[PDB]
């Protein structure tokens, strides 16, 4: 009974860091993706 | 072949004799280019082991097959030759690729071979036969498929693991097909659903001009999706399939509008029970296609309750099954 | 809430402090939250 | 167990230098609870190893460890044969090698001897190494000694493909003793951490290894500045402050006169 | 038993992606550091 | 972040 909680509980932390993990991945693609057209274009004009 | 008449001319004596006279004079720049700077080795090293792969394709088999079975067959060998590929250097990208390809030779056979089954000169089990066994060539497809994924994953999981790049999605030509044929077997069964019992609705109890217009109508309606090529998966083809389709559900929707006029007559003229479930009766197909069942649940308050306070036994059951349609017990209400 | 009054400075005093400035420019050549629960499964 | 964690790093890096492979194979023995991860924190002298195939010494870290196997960078095979391991890549590889023969030059030119061992592994859109460089001191002269540095290097490659991110953390482990007749024993451990970044241009006229070579030689010239010069002379400066040479009459009478010409010199401003 | 194990696992997976997130976290900063002032040199050679 | 990804992918599909 009370291990099958603490599988809900932990279950429950576990995928809520997931998900942060999932955004902190999702900002770095998008600091990769504005990195590559800022970079891309400010090197075409020099 | 190239590759081989190459080897063999460098190792003539005249080639052998100037490498010699070269390496004399010590000239070694031109000795060991020769050697190293041609790609020689390495491009005979990567053919050789490209080699059991193209050893024995087994494509001429698909190519050359005319029935359905036959490309079922030539399929699982070509998959089953693909197998090979685990001892074989190959990239995962281009793999890939020729898969994509040989859906793309799949689809064009499919395509000669169903066209030339003449589809209208024929009756509808044979068509769903013809059907069965295309999807059963899909699903083979699909299954091999997976096998094949499952293998490559095993393989790129060993060596390099590709970081670079992990787009490795199929979009198979083969597909837009399969799907095209899957219309038009939900097509032709709402078809059949229809044609196969309004003749029994339409049929006195043993002739109106309103049964020979609607069935008329309905084979009117038939002949015009008929006269465009279903099998054409290009686009004007499927345009045409669309405006086809549209025409189709527009009349069978004004056939049923007036059905659902003589629906509304049911009202108008039975006054108890017994003759509104001797009107249902006379109509069977009505029961199951998906718009007359709202003036079904416009009469079923009417009579299903009042069948029930009838009965708060065998003759109850079935005015109870008159208003559900064959098969009563299957219904949510019927459960009870 | 009012506005505040916003003003320019007067021509002069303007021209005055620009000079001030010119003067004193030298003649040149010419998060934790996502991180909070990082830290308590660590512990865990 | 973090603060018995904290506990057990202090009184290591508390313990002489010398004796940190038995003391710390004893405080395993204390709290293994912890052990594995005070191995992650607490930095070790290396081991050396046997490569056979091609016979040459390579240097025994965590990064090419495979369980309780180690990987050699020449052979690119497990000292205990492996039936299943970890290979870095294709590419890696290469660069793995020339790394391996652009740091036995650096160690040649730069130590004369001792060991060296570059370890490459792929990284999130880039690739990390580890250079490992052991030099143990020739018993030909009175001097003995040993030193060890792992130089962990981030390379994050920019999307263009030219440029490069590079993250630099050295650690070097050093020890000397001399026998000298005015001297009589002297016996100098010490140990030493930095860490820099730095971004760069990659081209073919100025490759990868390259700049991660240049960053380890500058790191390498620093520390080496550093523990021969302040943490030397501080030593130096505490074993002159502990005794003096000069008596204190004398240094009272210099102390007076110092007093004297800095309030003259106050008086005067 | 194998609810055990379960417990066991799912902590690997908290710890993993705990660790991970951090790192993600550290990285994304860092990135973002280098980005704005390679920008700013950029700039300044334009 | 491949590694980080295949880690997600197995707690996805389970």
Known sequence: PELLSVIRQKEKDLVLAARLGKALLERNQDMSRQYEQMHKELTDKL | ?336 | VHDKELAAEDEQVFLMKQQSLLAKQPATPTEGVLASFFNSLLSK | SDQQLDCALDLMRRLPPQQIEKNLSDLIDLVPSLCEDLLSSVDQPLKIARDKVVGKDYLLCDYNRDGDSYRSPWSNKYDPPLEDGAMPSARLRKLEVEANNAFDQYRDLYFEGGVSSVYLWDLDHGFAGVILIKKAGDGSKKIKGCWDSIHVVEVQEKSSGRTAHYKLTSTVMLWLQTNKSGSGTMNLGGSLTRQMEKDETVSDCSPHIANIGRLVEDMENKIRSTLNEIYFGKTKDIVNGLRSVQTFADKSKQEALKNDLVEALKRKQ
């Open chain 2, 1 to 336: 072949r190239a590759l081989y008449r190459i080897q063999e001319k460098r190792e003539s004596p005249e080639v052998l004799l100037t490498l010699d006279i070269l390496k004399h004079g010590k000239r070694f720049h031109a000795t060991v280019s020769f050697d190293t700077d041609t790609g020689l080795k390495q491009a005979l090293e990567t053919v050789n082991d490209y080699n059991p792969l193209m050893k024995d394709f087994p494509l001429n088999d698909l190519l050359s097959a005319t029935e359905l079975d036959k490309i079922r067959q030539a399929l699982v060998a070509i998959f089953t030759h693909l197998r090979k590929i685990r001892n074989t250097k190959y990239p995962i990208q281009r793999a890939l690729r020729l898969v994509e390809a040989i859906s793309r030779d799949l689809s064009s056979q499919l395509l000669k071979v169903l066209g030339t089954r003449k589809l209208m000169h024929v009756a509808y089990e044979e068509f769903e036969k013809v059907m069965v066994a295309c999807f059963e060539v899909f699903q083979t497809w699909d299954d091999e498929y997976e096998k094949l994924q499952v293998l490559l994953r095993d393989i790129v999981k060993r060596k390099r693991e590709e970081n670079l790049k992990m787009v490795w999605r199929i979009n198979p030509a083969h597909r837009k097909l399969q799907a095209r044929l899957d219309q038009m077997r939900k097509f032709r069964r709402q078809h059949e659903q229809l044609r196969a019992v309004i003749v029994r609705v339409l049929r006195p109890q043993v002739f109106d001009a309103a049964d020979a217009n609607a069935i008329e109508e309905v084979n009117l309606a038939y002949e015009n999706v008929k006269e465009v090529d279903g099998l054409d998966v290009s686009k004007e083809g499927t345009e045409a399939w669309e405006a086809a389709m549209k025409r189709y559900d527009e009349r069978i929707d004004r056939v049923e509008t007036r059905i659902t006029a003589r629906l509304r007559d049911q009202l108008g003229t039975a006054k108890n029970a017994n003759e509104m479930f001797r009107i249902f009766s006379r109509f069977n197909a009505l029961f199951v296609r998906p718009h007359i069942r709202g003036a079904i649940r416009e009469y079923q308050t009417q009579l299903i309750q009042r069948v029930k306070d009838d009965i708060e036994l065998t003759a109850y059951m079935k005015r109870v099954e008159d208003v559900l349609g064959k098969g009563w017990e299957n219904h949510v209400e019927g459960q009870k």
